[PDB]
Amino acid sequence: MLTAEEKAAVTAFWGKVKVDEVGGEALGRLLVVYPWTQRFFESFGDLSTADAVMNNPKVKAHGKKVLDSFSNGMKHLDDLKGTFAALSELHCDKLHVDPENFKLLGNVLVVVLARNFGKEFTPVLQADFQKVVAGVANALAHRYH
Amino acid sequence: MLTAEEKAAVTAFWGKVKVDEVGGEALGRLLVVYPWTQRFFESFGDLSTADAVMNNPKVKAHGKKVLDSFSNGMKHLDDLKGTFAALSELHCDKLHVDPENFKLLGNVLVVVLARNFGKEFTPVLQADFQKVVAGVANALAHRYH
Amino acid sequence: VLSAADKGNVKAAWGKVGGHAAEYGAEALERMFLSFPTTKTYFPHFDLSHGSAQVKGHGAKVAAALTKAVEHLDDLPGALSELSDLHAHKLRVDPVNFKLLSHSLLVTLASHLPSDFTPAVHASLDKFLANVSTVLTSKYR
Amino acid sequence: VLSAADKGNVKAAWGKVGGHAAEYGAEALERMFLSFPTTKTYFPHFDLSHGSAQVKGHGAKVAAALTKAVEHLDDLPGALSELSDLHAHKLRVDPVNFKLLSHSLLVTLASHLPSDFTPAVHASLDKFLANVSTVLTSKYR
Numbered sequence: 049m050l051t052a053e054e055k056a057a058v059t060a061f062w063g064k065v066k067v068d069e070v071g072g073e074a075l076g077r078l079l080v081v082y083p084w085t086q087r088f089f090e091s092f093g094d095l096s097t098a099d100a101v102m103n104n105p106k107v108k109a110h111g112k113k114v115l116d117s118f119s120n121g122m123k124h125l126d127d128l129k130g131t132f133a134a135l136s137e138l139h140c141d142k143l144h145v146d147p148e149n150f151k152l153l154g155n156v157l158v159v160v161l162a163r164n165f166g167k168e169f170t171p172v173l174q175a176d177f178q179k180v181v182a183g184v185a186n187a188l189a190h191r192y193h
Numbered sequence: 194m195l196t197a198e199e200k201a202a203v204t205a206f207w208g209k210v211k212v213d214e215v216g217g218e219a220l221g222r223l224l225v226v227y228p229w230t231q232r233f234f235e236s237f238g239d240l241s242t243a244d245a246v247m248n249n250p251k252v253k254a255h256g257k258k259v260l261d262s263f264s265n266g267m268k269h270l271d272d273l274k275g276t277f278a279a280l281s282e283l284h285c286d287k288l289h290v291d292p293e294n295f296k297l298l299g300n301v302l303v304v305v306l307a308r309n310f311g312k313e314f315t316p317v318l319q320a321d322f323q324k325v326v327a328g329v330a331n332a333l334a335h336r337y338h
Numbered sequence: 339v340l341s342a343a344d345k346g347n348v349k350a351a352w353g354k355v356g357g358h359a360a361e362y363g364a365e366a367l368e369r370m371f372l373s374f375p376t377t378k379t380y381f382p383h384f385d386l387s388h389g390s391a392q393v394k395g396h397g398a399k400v401a402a403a404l405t406k407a408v409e410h411l412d413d414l415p416g417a418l419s420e421l422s423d424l425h426a427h428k429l430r431v432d433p434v435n436f437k438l439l440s441h442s443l444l445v446t447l448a449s450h451l452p453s454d455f456t457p458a459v460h461a462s463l464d465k466f467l468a469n470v471s472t473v474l475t476s477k478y479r
Numbered sequence: 480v481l482s483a484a485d486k487g488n489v490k491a492a493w494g495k496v497g498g499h500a501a502e503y504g505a506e507a508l509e510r511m512f513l514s515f516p517t518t519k520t521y522f523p524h525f526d527l528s529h530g531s532a533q534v535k536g537h538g539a540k541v542a543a544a545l546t547k548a549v550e551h552l553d554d555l556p557g558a559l560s561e562l563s564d565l566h567a568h569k570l571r572v573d574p575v576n577f578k579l580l581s582h583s584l585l586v587t588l589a590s591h592l593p594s595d596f597t598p599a600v601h602a603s604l605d606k607f608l609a610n611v612s613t614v615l616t617s618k619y620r
């Protein structure tokens with residue numbers, strides 16, 4: 049994973065993150081930007097417009113749980129594989145989500161952080177977060193590869 | 194990996210392969226079908242037309258080495274990771290080959306086996322070979338994920 | 339984007355397919371379901387057992403849409419607008435699955451037309467199928 | 480394929496970019512090189528140090544091309560022909576790198592235009608950059 053100075057910068061940034069706002073936003077934009085992802089959330093209600101998706105109460109509530117899951121990941125950066133093993137099996141065996149989609153959500157989350165923090169989400173910070181989301185994506189992909 | 198059933202089937206099929214020829218054809222097709230892959234072989238000489246790529250003597254020589262590497266993999270189906278550890282390091286650290294390209298070559302190989310064997314390359318055997326080439330591609334991608 | 343060479347390769351190749359298009363359509367779907375069994379979850383209402391009439395019938399429709407496509411290479415979004423609605427708006431098919439079917443079709447064609455399936459034709463066909471896939475996964479009306 | 484709404488969305492966003500296209504072009508490259516260092520291998524003759532003036536001049540060229548693309552959304556292959564020649568025939572850039580640059584650009588635009596970068600604009604810009612990337616990686620002449 050990351051050097052000790054890196055984890056430090058990354059942890060300290062992460063304490064700034066409003067997980068409610070950011071998780072609702074990220075899951076929302078996943079379903080708007082990559083619209084096929086809506087298939088996996090079909091019971092959530094109307095997702096036919098961008099506003100419908102971002103206003104959707106179940107999308108917000110689930111995006112919040114996704115980010116809590118990520119927040120948990122942030123505490124175990126040397127053991128993402130073990131941390132995410134149960135979720136890896138869930139998304140593979142029960143949800144049949146193609147693992148390409150894990151990288152897409154990770155990237156969408158980075159875009160959301162940038163939108164929410166501007167200048168403060170510096171290129172160095174973003175680079176470290178790229179390493180984090182790629183590590184989470186790979187951990188979640190482990191029960192295929 | 195595969196059952197002992199599927200291993201013997203795949204083994205017996207693989208015995209018919211003209212290792213040299215198939216290697217050349219598969220590497221050549223990778224460079225023709227996904228032309229950016231030529232960048233990695235720019236020292237090989239003329240790659241400007243499909244005919245030039247296919248008849249390129251360095252492409253043919255190297256395709257043979259690629260296929261010999263696969264035949265060795267065919268003998269070690271239960272430990273593809275360890276079998277490919279040196280090649281994983283080589284393609285990542287020295288060659289900077291994006292891992293998506295491993296899957297493309299595995300698929301092109303499958304297409305080549307179909308072309309060369311027709312109906313003998315049955316839906317069932319093709320399916321098992323999709324497991325082998327996804328296996329080899331995952332083993333080569335080990336030093337990023 | 340297809341070159342003029344790509345377009346002549348696509349039309350010449352699909353011309354060689356000819357009356358076998360239906361058969362090859364069915365065998366592509368069979369190879370896809372078999373090799374990549376998660377694709378079967380798109381068709382839970384089908385009988386997907388071996389040589390299912392439903393799969394063979396569905397193969398013919400897939401082949402016939404490709405035949406239509408081959409005839410409209412300069413305007414795939416217009417030609418395939420109704421299929422885009424079905425695949426991108428209605429079914430919400432993950433693009434990964436298009437790559438799997440495209441591959442299954444190449445494997446199918448390679449095995450029935452070993453002489454005509456040259457590296458150049460293989461390249462053009464792959465481009466053509468990627469372009470069809472982009473159309474069918476894009477919401478553009 | 481872009482909808483009418485996508486093309487309206489892309490123009491509206493680029494209009495909000497305004498005189499800052501060059502700056503955003505520079506920053507997107509900077510973020511690409513820092514986040515994804517294997518991209519630097521296409522630039523062995525560049526000064527790639529932090530704040531390098533060479534990266535800034537190149538980012539301006541990259542943004543001018545996109546400004547050109549936005550005025551020709553209906554014929555990108557015609558507008559981008561010379562750049563496809565460069566990136567597809569000459570440099571042979573792996574397509575994965577276009578996804579890395581496209582993502583770096585969305586990050587940059589989102590950071591600088593938090594009120595305009597709505598989810599629908601984000602969706603449209605992603606399709607637009609994918610379309611550009613397809614043109615620039617395709618050999619079609």
Ligand code: HEM
Pocket residue numbers: 085088089110113114117118135139143145149150153154184185188
């Ligand atoms: C960064 C990657 C991801 C993380 C950390 C993550 C995390 C989670 C978590 C914590 C849950 C709840 C598990 C539980 O309490 O049982 C969940 C469920 C779920 N996930 Fe994800 N996820 C990721 C990517 C994705 C993607 C890309 C998709 C689909 C495109 C997806 C689809 C689903 C679905 C459909 C559920 C069940 C939701 C329901 O109850 O209806 N996930 N995920």
Ligand code: HEM
Pocket residue numbers: 230233234255258259262263280283284288290294295298299329330333
């Ligand atoms: C199943 C996938 C692959 C296998 C089994 C494979 C196997 C090999 C082998 C056995 C070597 C010989 C290295 C040596 O003897 O030192 C080699 C070298 C190399 N491979 Fe691959 N390879 C694969 C995929 C790829 C792909 C997809 C690319 C690029 C698109 C690539 C690019 C290279 C290059 C540039 C070299 C060195 C060639 C030279 O001598 O200049 N490989 N590979």
Ligand code: HEM
Pocket residue numbers: 377380381399400403404421424425429431435436437439467470471474
């Ligand atoms: C080149 C790619 C494809 C083409 C040309 C194509 C074509 C077609 C056609 C012509 C139909 C029937 C339209 C009608 O009802 O008359 C159809 C339906 C359908 N397609 Fe595809 N398709 C492609 C890719 C895919 C993929 C990758 C999947 C999923 C793995 C998929 C899933 C479906 C499903 C579920 C239906 C509805 C089947 C039914 O109940 O009748 N398609 N497609």
Ligand code: HEM
Pocket residue numbers: 518521522540541544545562565566570572576577578580581608611612615
């Ligand atoms: C949004 C997609 C891209 C656009 C619009 C774009 C645009 C451009 C432009 C306008 C030029 C300058 C041509 C000139 O000097 O007249 C250029 C050159 C170049 N591009 Fe890109 N580019 C893109 C993606 C990429 C990517 C992903 C890479 C590789 C990581 C790349 C590598 C290069 C290289 C190596 C040069 C030549 C630089 C030099 O020697 O001066 N391009 N590009």
